[PDB]
Amino acid sequence: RGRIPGRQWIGKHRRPRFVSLRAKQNMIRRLEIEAENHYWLSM
Amino acid sequence: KSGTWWDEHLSEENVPFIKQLVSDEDKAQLASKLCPLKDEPWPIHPWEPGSFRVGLIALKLGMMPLWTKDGQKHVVTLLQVQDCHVLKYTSKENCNGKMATLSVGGKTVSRFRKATSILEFYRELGLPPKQTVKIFNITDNAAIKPGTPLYAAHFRPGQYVDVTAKTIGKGFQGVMKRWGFKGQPATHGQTKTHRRPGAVATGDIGRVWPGTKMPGKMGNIYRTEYGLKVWRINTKHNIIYVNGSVPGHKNCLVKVKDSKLPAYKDLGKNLPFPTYFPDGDEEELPEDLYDENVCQPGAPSITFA
Amino acid sequence: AAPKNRRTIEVNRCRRRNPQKLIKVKNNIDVCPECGHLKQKHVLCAYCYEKVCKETAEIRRQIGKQEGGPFKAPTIETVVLYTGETPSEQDQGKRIIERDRKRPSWFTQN
Amino acid sequence: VKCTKARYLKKKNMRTLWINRITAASQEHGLKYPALIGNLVKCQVELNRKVLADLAIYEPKTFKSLAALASRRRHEGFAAALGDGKEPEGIFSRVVQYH
Amino acid sequence: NTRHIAFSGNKWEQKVYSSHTGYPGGFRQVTAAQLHLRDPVAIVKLAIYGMLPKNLHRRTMMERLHLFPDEYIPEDILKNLVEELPQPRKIPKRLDEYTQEEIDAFPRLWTPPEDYRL
Amino acid sequence: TARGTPSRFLASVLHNGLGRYVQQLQRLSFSVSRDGASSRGAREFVEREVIDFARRNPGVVIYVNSRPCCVPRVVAEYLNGAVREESIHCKSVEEISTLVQKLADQSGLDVIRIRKPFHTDNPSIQGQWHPFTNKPTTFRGLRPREVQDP
Amino acid sequence: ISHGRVFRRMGLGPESRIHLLRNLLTGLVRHERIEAPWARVDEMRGYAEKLIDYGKLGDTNERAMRMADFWLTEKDLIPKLFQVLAPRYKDQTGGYTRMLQIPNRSLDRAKMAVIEYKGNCLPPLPLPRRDSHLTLLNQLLQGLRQDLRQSQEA
RNA sequence: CUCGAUGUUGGAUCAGGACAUCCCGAUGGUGCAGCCGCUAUUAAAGGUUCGUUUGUUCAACGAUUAAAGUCCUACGUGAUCUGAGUUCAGACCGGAGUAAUCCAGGUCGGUUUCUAUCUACUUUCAAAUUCCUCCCUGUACGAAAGGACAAGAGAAAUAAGGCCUACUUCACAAAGCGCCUUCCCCCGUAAAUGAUAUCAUCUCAACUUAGUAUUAUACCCACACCCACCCAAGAACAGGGUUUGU
RNA sequence: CUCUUACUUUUAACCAGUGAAAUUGACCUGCCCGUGAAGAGGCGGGCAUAACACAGCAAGACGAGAAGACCCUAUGGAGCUUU
RNA sequence: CUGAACUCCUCACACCCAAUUGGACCAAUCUAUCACCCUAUAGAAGAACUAAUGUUAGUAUAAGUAACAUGAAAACAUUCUC
RNA sequence: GUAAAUUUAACUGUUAGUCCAAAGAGGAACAGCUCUUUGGACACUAGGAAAAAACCUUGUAGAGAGAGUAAAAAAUUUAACA
Ligand SMILES: [K+]
Ligand SMILES: [K+]
Ligand SMILES: [K+]
Ligand SMILES: [K+]
Ligand SMILES: [K+]
Ligand SMILES: [K+]
Ligand SMILES: [K+]
Ligand SMILES: [Mg+2]
Ligand SMILES: [Mg+2]
Ligand SMILES: [Mg+2]
Ligand SMILES: [Mg+2]
Ligand SMILES: [Mg+2]
Ligand SMILES: [Mg+2]
Ligand SMILES: [Mg+2]
Ligand SMILES: [Mg+2]
Ligand SMILES: [Mg+2]
Ligand SMILES: [Mg+2]
Ligand SMILES: [Mg+2]
Ligand SMILES: [Mg+2]
Ligand SMILES: [Mg+2]
Ligand SMILES: [Mg+2]
Ligand SMILES: [Mg+2]
Ligand SMILES: [Mg+2]
Ligand SMILES: [Mg+2]
Ligand SMILES: [Mg+2]
Ligand SMILES: [Mg+2]
Ligand SMILES: [Mg+2]
Ligand SMILES: [Mg+2]
Ligand SMILES: [Mg+2]
Ligand SMILES: [Mg+2]
Ligand SMILES: [Mg+2]
Ligand SMILES: [Mg+2]
Ligand SMILES: [Mg+2]
Ligand SMILES: [Mg+2]
Ligand SMILES: [Mg+2]
Ligand SMILES: [Mg+2]
Ligand SMILES: [Mg+2]
Ligand SMILES: [Mg+2]
Ligand SMILES: [Mg+2]
Ligand SMILES: [Mg+2]
Ligand SMILES: [Mg+2]
Ligand SMILES: [Mg+2]
Ligand SMILES: [Mg+2]
Ligand SMILES: [Mg+2]
Ligand SMILES: [Mg+2]
Ligand SMILES: [Zn+2]
């Protein structure tokens, strides 16, 4: 049981990928850097 | 470093003497156990619900017809008890099981063809070796002292029993005789395929399931026939007339005991318990013990009146 | 059906040198008390059985010189005599086969 | 090729082994691996996994001193998290500066 | 005391242990309760066997594991003990195990009406 | 490979360097050719370098056998008995001057895989760890659930 | 499955089997000793025993003469059965022949056997002999016997 | 993906599995009186016929059955079979084409190899399913016609496993056409007590009952006399007997 | 055929003698689910697992055998017919 | 906190793309001249094989497998069976 | 801010494309389908997403029994009513 039709991560019916908690934090950490980059590029 | 047998170095004069010598000892050993109630027997408890007594080990003589008082014909199997004794007893605790085991042997065999460890067990028991030794699960209130002889009157007419024995050996056989496969037709183009199994499995699995019916050795295994009643008991020769057929060939040793079928549960209330002791019997039994619905040979002809 | 792969010498030594393949030692061998040669406990001595056949053949060659043809067997008993022997009391009216040789020691006159 | 690629696994499996041995020696003193490594760095003690695991086997009395130090610095961090800055820093929380 | 383990949630009913005899139709599925009544040491034994590394050494580690349903232990195994590990879970107390001090120490929170039948 | 080769533990010869350092290189045997282009670099090493190299290493006995040969070799013998044979075939003086000095610096122990980059005969000073090291003792040395004074 | 089958399957069929056994029996009556494969002799030994029983019935019994006429291909041997062999075993009721195993023959390493008629005029075969009564073991038993006999008489 | 080859119809043989259940089992609803039915919930242990025409799968038809289930497994299975059909080389009819030749066409005929190296398997040991008959009973039900369930008894079939007294094929024995034996359950719901919600309420409230088996028990359980012989044991090996080793 | 059975012979298997062939990348050559050049003994997660011969079976090794004869391609051939 | 061949640290540095392209070295053989336990500088060339259902030869696997053979006794004279 | 670019001379090979995101066409707002455009990756290494050509992290090459990091783990539990 549990076949993903075809190849997993391509096509119409794909294997679902879920966002972990550290994946969120990793993205937020990147945003805080680039948000501070906008401040130093403004003067 | 060469093996030897019992009469390899004996002369022409000692072979007859040794044969008769050991033969007379067996007679004396067997004729010394006929009084078990005088030789410090163990306590004799009465029969209680849920009790299980010992069985016997008989020899299959043959088959005989039998007619009832209604006219119907029944075929029975003759089971002779010969040299049956209790070898040892193991308690429930030491048994590592719910019940307690009682060991029983049958059919005295030669001492020259047995293992040393087996010969010494019988030496202290005061009995000749036995061919077959079977284990019976009993209750604490049915233990019998080892060396006690066992007879055919241990069972009674109207009682159902379970006979176990090895089946006739037929060697390596195909699927047609071993499993009842139909095979293939004789004509209409068939090419060297008349008694073959055909397909053994599907293609997907890529293998053969365990337990798949294939050619192999058939027979020569233990099988039990449940629900066989005792029609007649002969006390002179210690013979049991069992209904129908039983597994095994003629002159084979079979295991007999009360039937486990629920329908015949708690029917040993009127039976001997633990076993029948002729030595202490207040009155000897008749020659033969018949059932109510059995018409004896001496009886007159049947008449539906 | 053909082999899919080649079997290795390691696989084949385990099949060829399996104890079942090996020859089993025999323990039924002993010496003949007469000649001292070897023999099996259940088989006759090849040496002592051979000397009976050499003499038995010579006796059968003498029988032919008396019969002098086929389908000429007698209706009486037969006796073998050697140099230095005469018909016994019980060997009367029999077919004596004269042998130009000393009687074998193992051959006991009956 | 296996021997040439195995030089990356050897270094990885060593550090995996050291950590497993440090984790075991820290539980003997009621500590976890993250609380020992993280709080020894806070005390300016720069000892690597290789040395620490060697100390746990051959210098057990020195490894308990390092675990007691980490537990002391860990408790000072909690105490500072309960205050609002008024209370001064702990004795083992001070940092030596290099100019 | 492997017979007195406690599962959280409804795992006695939901959790299933599945096996196969190898024969057609030999796939069996029993609940943890059914297995526990049949073998009071199988649940703890199967959890440990699944946590050990998937290698040849695992069957050697399981010979050094001794499980007993009740608190009885053989003398031999009881003469070579060294240390007793603390229980991970703290067994909570029933309302009949509290002393009269703790019951009176905990304050009452509401004032029931006097005309309530209860 | 390591599995296709042998190995040894890091070691020294007679605990060298502990009380004093003793040079393990004991003998050097050169085989140069009077004629031959292969030995050109070896001939120039014997004219200016070998004499100055012996002044610095007085404990090494150097033998220069000039004979016909197509491949010149230098044989180094060490105190421990090891013998390493090397070829200076078509090598410049600078290459032979760094080679001979390498031989003088080595100990003679087989140049094979060394298991550990460290060696100590006294690894512990507080006691090698054992199961009971960090365990507390109980009153009367009792065991778990052991009835005392029964 | 062969349970109870007492006769073997040799030759090219049931009839050929009887013809093979007949050629061995005929040679056994002419020479009184032959060597042949062990299985073929053990199968013929039974017929050699029952042939003497027909020779004791006499040459006047037609049934007995029809057996010898069939089982003896050479007709000069029929009088030898009724006039030489049967009289010899007149006192005996059985055990007219002895069969002994001999070394396997070289050509095919087949199991061999020698069979003869007891009382023949040929050099005695090297029969196997039992250990003497004067041996250590038999003397220890002979002494045991005497006591058991002596005690019984007492 | 495979054309330095994955042999393709149906059938025979052996069947593994799913449940979306044709029959048997347990339940709710009914425009369910009863006997028959419709519908839904649960259940995959067990079972699911013989024949005429057709190459057929299907389909029609005849006679039955408690029922003659739907599907997947390389449209399961040709190193097991079959070759009627399709699908070469021959030929005929009709049609197309100047002809050679061709057609979704129809028709007669037409070579089906392989000594098994590896994997897997070769006694899942032993609780059985159903119909009919009698009886209940011409009872409940019902205007009438009509016609039950449960309990109980008996007699068969099939299946599984065994046996040879007789019968039959046979004859120191092997067989069936013959005889003997065959033991547990399954959960959908229906009901009480009683809170959240002071009634009531079968309760993913605590609880009670119909309502549950550690599936029961049975079988098996000793071991260098063993060269040789014998056997109801067997390919070999092994096994049983020799107190019948001239 | 319902519905098979018994016996003989050959074959067979064991002993002795003689002694081929196709085939073979290497092999220390298990099962379930999943994955994937889309159908796994070799990958992932699990289960199983001292070594070894002989006799059987034909589900798999997309088993062996013949560089597919069906189909398509080649400015590759050939036979036949023809306004 | 764990976590790369990313980055830092000690030392070193030309030393991880198919087709294609550029460049630096080189085995053995012959020749010239050297050399003289096997080399040097150059000049030449039938100048380097884990693979073409490759060619020849040898030996394995399958495999001690498939398959093959002699009518019987005896005096080797002869007879008997078919 | 960076160090490439054009031209001149002399050549070979590639010209049978795959998935992902985005804008679109065809198909059925099916296809691991087909056809263009923009860009990325693969056809080169390593780590991660379970196994993994195309998603994410990451590139310039050696040794080391040192260190700091990158991407990187799935969450949810339901219907009373005057
Ligand atoms: K997909
Ligand atoms: K499979
Ligand atoms: K193809
Ligand atoms: K409610
Ligand atoms: K028959
Ligand atoms: K196969
Ligand atoms: K093929
Ligand atoms: Mg897929
Ligand atoms: Mg048999
Ligand atoms: Mg048939
Ligand atoms: Mg054929
Ligand atoms: Mg046929
Ligand atoms: Mg191929
Ligand atoms: Mg359903
Ligand atoms: Mg079914
Ligand atoms: Mg198919
Ligand atoms: Mg075929
Ligand atoms: Mg097939
Ligand atoms: Mg046809
Ligand atoms: Mg026409
Ligand atoms: Mg046709
Ligand atoms: Mg024809
Ligand atoms: Mg085959
Ligand atoms: Mg009824
Ligand atoms: Mg109520
Ligand atoms: Mg209420
Ligand atoms: Mg052979
Ligand atoms: Mg090939
Ligand atoms: Mg798969
Ligand atoms: Mg095999
Ligand atoms: Mg493969
Ligand atoms: Mg081709
Ligand atoms: Mg042309
Ligand atoms: Mg790291
Ligand atoms: Mg880098
Ligand atoms: Mg670099
Ligand atoms: Mg060179
Ligand atoms: Mg060349
Ligand atoms: Mg080569
Ligand atoms: Mg080649
Ligand atoms: Mg083979
Ligand atoms: Mg053969
Ligand atoms: Mg282009
Ligand atoms: Mg183009
Ligand atoms: Mg595409
Ligand atoms: Zn002799």
Long-range contacts of F61-66 (CB under 8 A, 24+ apart): F61/F26, F61/F27, F61/F28, F62/F27, F62/F28, F62/F29, F62/F30, F63/F27, F63/F28, F63/F29, F63/F30, F64/F30, F64/F32, F65/F29, F65/F30, F65/F31, F65/F32, F66/F32, F66/F33, F66/F34
Dihedral sign of CA atoms B65, B67, B72, B78 in order: negative
Instruction: List Cβ neighbours of D8 (8 Å cut-off, separation of 6 or more).
Output: none
The reply to whether C14 sits in an annotated binding site is no
Structural domain contains residue C102: yes
In terms of CA atoms, which chain G residue is nearest residue C91? G121
Structure tokens at G62: 């037609």
Nearest-CA neighbor of F103 among F77, F65, F64? F77
Residues in chain C: 110
B contact residues 175-194, partner C, Cβ 8 Å cutoff: none
Q: Is the CB of C1 under 7 A from strand J?
A: no
Q: Convert chain D into a string of H (helix), E (strand) and C (coil).
A: CHHHHHHHHHHHHHHHHHHHHHHHHHHCCCCCHHHHHHHHHCCCCCCCHHHHHHHHHHCHHHHHHHHHHHHHHHHHHHHHHHCCCCCCCCCCCCCCCCC
Residue whose CA is minimally distant from K45 C1': D5
Resolution stated for this PDB structure, in Å: 2.9
Do residues C59 and C97 make contact, with C-beta atoms less than 8 angstroms apart?
yes
DSSP G101: E
Whether F contacts A, i.e. 3 or more CB pairs less than 8 A apart, is: no
> What is each CA distance from G69 to G54, G66, G90, in whole angstroms?
12, 5, 21
Q: Is the CB of C15 under 7 A from strand J?
A: yes
Q: Count Cα neighbours of A12 within 13 Å in the Cβ-side half-sphere.
A: 1
- How many CB atoms are located within 10 Å of the residue C72 CB? 10
Q: Which of B 223-242 have CB under 7 A of nucleic chain H?
A: 223-228
Q: How far is C77 from chain G (nearest CA, A)?
A: 6
Structure tokens at B208: 């053969």
Distance CA B63, CA B66 (A): 10
| Domain locations in chain G as residue ranges | 10-120
- Distance between the alpha carbon (CA) of D1 and the C1' atom of K3, Å: 39
Amino acid symbol at G14: P
Do residues C104 and C58 make contact, with C-beta atoms less than 8 angstroms apart?
no
The reply to whether C35 sits in an annotated binding site is yes
Structural domain contains residue C96: yes
Dihedral sign of CA atoms C58, C62, C67, C73 in order: negative
Three-state DSSP class for B229? strand
The reply to whether C45 sits in an annotated binding site is yes
Cis peptide, bond prior to residue F150, ω within 30 of zero = no
Containing H/E element for C57? helix C46-67
Instruction: List Cβ neighbours of F122 (8 Å cut-off, separation of 6 or more).
Output: none
Structure tokens at C56: 């038995």
Q: How far is D89 from chain F (nearest CA, A)?
A: 32
Three-state DSSP class for B79? strand
Identify any residues that bridge with B106 across adjacent strands, giving them in sequence order. Answer: B132
Distance CA B97, CA B89 (A): 14
Distance CA B276, CA B81 (A): 14
Q: Which domain holds residue C73?
A: 27-108
Three-state DSSP class for E69? coil
DSSP result, C29-54: EEE-TTT--EEETTS--HHHHHHHHH
DSSP result, G8-55: ---TTSHHHHHHHHHHHHHHHHHHSEEEEEHHHHHHHHHHHHHHHHHH
Structure tokens at B151: 């007879």
E contact residues 72-101, partner F, Cβ 8 Å cutoff: 78-79, 81-84
Instruction: List Cβ neighbours of G119 (8 Å cut-off, separation of 6 or more).
Output: G88, G89
Nearest-CA neighbor of B55 among B300, B228, B295, B185? B228
How many domains does the structure of chain C reveal? 1
User: What positions of strand I are covered by protein, i.e. any atom < 7 Å from a CB?
Assistant: 1-10, 15-16, 22-39, 41, 45-47, 49, 51-64
Whether G contacts B, i.e. 3 or more CB pairs less than 8 A apart, is: yes
Q: How far is the CA of B264 from the centre of ligand 17 (A)?
A: 57
Q: Count Cα neighbours of C39 within 13 Å in the Cβ-side half-sphere.
A: 22
Q: Which residues in chain F are contacts of D3 at CB distance < 8 A?
A: 2
- Distance between the alpha carbon (CA) of E108 and the C1' atom of H201, Å: 32
Identify any residues that bridge with E30 across adjacent strands, giving them in sequence order. Answer: E17
DSSP result, E37-60: HH-TTHHHHHHHHHHS-SSTTHHH
DSSP B43: P
Alpha carbon of residue D22 to chain centroid: 9
Distance CA E49, CA C46 (A): 68
* Contacting subunits of E (3+ beta carbon pairs below 8 A): B, F
- φ, ψ at C17 (rounded to 5°): -95, 15
Nearest-CA neighbor of B166 among B50, B254, B259? B254
Structure tokens at B216: 């192999």
Distance CA B287, CA B289 (A): 7
In terms of CA atoms, which chain F residue is nearest residue E79? F143
Three-state DSSP class for C20? coil
- Superfamily of structural domain G10-120: Ribosomal protein L17 (3.90.1030.10)
Residues in chain A: 43
Q: If 0-12 CB within 10 Å is exposed, 13-18 middle and 19+ buried, where does residue E67 land?
A: middle
| Domain locations in chain E as residue ranges | 1-118
CB contact under 8 A, F145 and E79: no
Name the CA dihedral angle for F50, F53, F58, F60, rounded to a multiple of 10 degrees.
-60
Structure tokens at C57: 């053949």
Structure tokens at C24: 């089993």
Q: How far is E77 from chain B (nearest CA, A)?
A: 21
CB contact under 8 A, B1 and C28: no
Structure tokens at D8: 């990356």
For D58, which of F2, F124, F134 is closest by C-beta distance?
Answer: F124
Identify any residues that bridge with B102 across adjacent strands, giving them in sequence order. Answer: B89, B136
Method: cryo-EM
Structure-token match 């093979």, residue found: G20
Nearest-CA neighbor of B237 among B117, B153, B144? B153
What is the number of the ligand closest to the CA of G4? 9
Q: Which of B 184-223 have CB under 7 A of nucleic chain H?
A: 184-185, 188-193, 196-205, 207-223
Distance CA C22, CA C17 (A): 7
Tell me the Ramachandran region of residue E9: left when phi exceeds 0, alpha when psi lies from -120 to 50, beta otherwise.
Answer: left
Distance CA B187, CA B185 (A): 6
What is the number of the ligand closest to the CA of A11? 1
Name the CA dihedral angle for C53, C55, C58, C59, rounded to a multiple of 10 degrees.
-100
Three-state DSSP class for B51? coil
Structural domain contains residue C50: yes
Q: Is the CB of G112 under 7 A from strand J?
A: no
Q: How far is the CA of C3 from the centre of ligand 13 (A)?
A: 15
Distance CA F145, CA D26 (A): 27
Name the CA dihedral angle for E4, E7, E13, E14, rounded to a multiple of 10 degrees.
-150
Q: Say whether residue F5 is in contact with chain D using an 8 A CB cutoff.
A: no
> What is each CA distance from D40 to B66, B209, D49, D66, D69, in whole angstroms?
99, 61, 12, 8, 8
Best residue in F135, F137, F142, F143 for a mutation probing chain E (most E CBs within 10 Å): F143
